[PDB]
């Protein structure tokens, strides 16, 4: 119900849980990114067992090519994976 406003605020809320975990509060390192994916998505998404998977994802999210995806880069990875959720979460 036009609840798009609560959805944007929640998307940012989870990001603060991991970004504030380490000094890169305004930036995420492929290392911090792995914790978001492996630890936060314990069962919601296929956990990552090898950091190499994160390195490959870095090629896609490392838009700046610095080995670190900025909070803006992290945000785009959430929209594409959700699209997969539509196939699984078919409302109907």
């Amino acid at each position: 119900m036009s609840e798009l406003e609560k959805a944007m605020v929640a998307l940012i809320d989870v990001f603060h849980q991991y970004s504030g975990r380490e000094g890169d509060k305004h930036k995420l390192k492929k290392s911090e990114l792995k914790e978001l994916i492996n630890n936060e998505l314990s069962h919601f998404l296929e956990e990552i067992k090898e950091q190499e998977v994160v390195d490959k994802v870095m090629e896609t999210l490392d838009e700046d090519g610095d080995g670190e995806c900025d909070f803006q880069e992290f945000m785009a990875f959430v929209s594409m994976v959700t699209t997969a959720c539509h196939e699984f979460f078919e409302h109907e």
Partner: peptide, 22 residues
């Protein structure tokens, strides 16, 4: 010819998400 199929290895799971890339 010089491409590596790399069949096997559970790591393939990453390719499942690549369908999103696309």
């Amino acid at each position: 010819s010089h491409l590596k199929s790399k069949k096997g290895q559970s790591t393939s799971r990453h390719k499942k998400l690549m369908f999103k890339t696309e």
